Symmetry: C2
Subunit: 219 residues, 2 copies
């Protein structure tokens, strides 16, 4: 699916990317590059098939953070990603796994269009580049490096979410996850089990504690 | 409801009760007092109103622990208690909130009778005593003191399970809970978030680690 987006090259690579083993040498952009200057960026990533439970709290977290000064960063994927980003509009930044002349995934086209208009989409791929395993992985590192904090509402083991969670640890980004029952989100529960992530046991307090840590007003 | 239990004096008060600020001065018993001389006693306590999820794993915990050399200790209450005890039979000990000439609660009479017959019931009251305010708290102190480890599968804030949880901490009895969703078991979740309990993220590993720790053959 062609995007028909009008895009250009990003003038300056965010310094947040310098922590990366292999920073992007060149980035392409469509939308509001001012979003890159915001004080609080929160990554929200997760499974392509969240439960109603996960979906419900993903919406609240995204909506409330975006409404109170944060910018939500994600990969625009089916499920948790696109849910967070739609509910954060227009304070949201997407890292694309393909070049900006294409929409992926197809079914998210409507929301992705709205991000291109009112939010920001970045890509490391100039044109004609359909997504492949390595480009999903590569853009995940950008999602993590760009963000101050990383939330994973729900995720299985051996998922992109878990490789991103490893990156979050490697790059010292605080990891947060939703409390989940046995067997429903083994990835996030493993992170809890090993003390590699903090549980979000109260949505409003978590949000307010984040706002304060970054000198924004609470709710 | 009368029990028709031919209860005895429990002649030797278990040393485990000696840690209490107010040890029971006299105890009464019916059933197998040898259960008191076992290497591993696990308290399983919780809400009177468990979800199907909590119920399902309580059954598994109780059954597997009882089958592999542990004894399950509880209060015989509606919900988690009676579920755990029924599935632990005959390796189970009930601490009764009433004298042993009565059944309490009435609706648990069948399992409670099975416990009198094949497990063990203890009480701090001799006769003619139905429970009153505080007698539940009182027998809970006994459940905790007797047990090596305490499992709370599900519980609300301000419940009896939480006051028992405070006792477990006071006496350094390790405390474990089931992973629970936001807004379902605020009691156990608060324990988890405050680092006061450990989560059971893998039922089989939890059990095998517990066993090993008490020099029992792993499953």
């Amino acid at each position: 699916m062609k995007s028909h987006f009008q895009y250009s090259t990003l003038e300056n690579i965010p310094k947040a990317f310098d922590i990366l083993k292999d920073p992007p040498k060149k980035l392409y952009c469509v939308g509001d590059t001012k979003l890159l200057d915001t004080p609080l960026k929160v990554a929200i990533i997760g499974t392509r098939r969240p439960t109603p439970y996960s979906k419900q709290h993903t919406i609240t977290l995204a909506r409330e953070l975006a409404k109170n000064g944060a910018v939500i960063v994600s990969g625009g994927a089916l499920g948790v990603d696109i849910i967070a980003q739609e509910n954060a509009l227009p304070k949201t930044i997407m890292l694309s796994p393909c070049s900006l002349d294409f929409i992926y995934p197809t079914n998210n086209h409507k929301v992705i269009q709205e991000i291109a208009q009112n939010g920001l989409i970045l890509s490391e791929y100039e044109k004609d580049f359909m997504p492949i395993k390595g480009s999903f992985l590569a853009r995940n590192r950008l999602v993590i490096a760009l963000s101050d904090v990383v939330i994973i509402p729900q995720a299985d083991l051996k998922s992109g979410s878990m490789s991103s969670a490893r990156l979050a640890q490697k790059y010292q980004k605080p990891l947060f996850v939703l409390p989940q029952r046995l067997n429903e989100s083994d990835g996030t529960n493993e992170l809890l089990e090993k003390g590699q992530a903090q549980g979000i046991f109260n949505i409003q307090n978590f949000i307010n504690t984040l706002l304060k840590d970054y000198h924004l007003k609470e709710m």
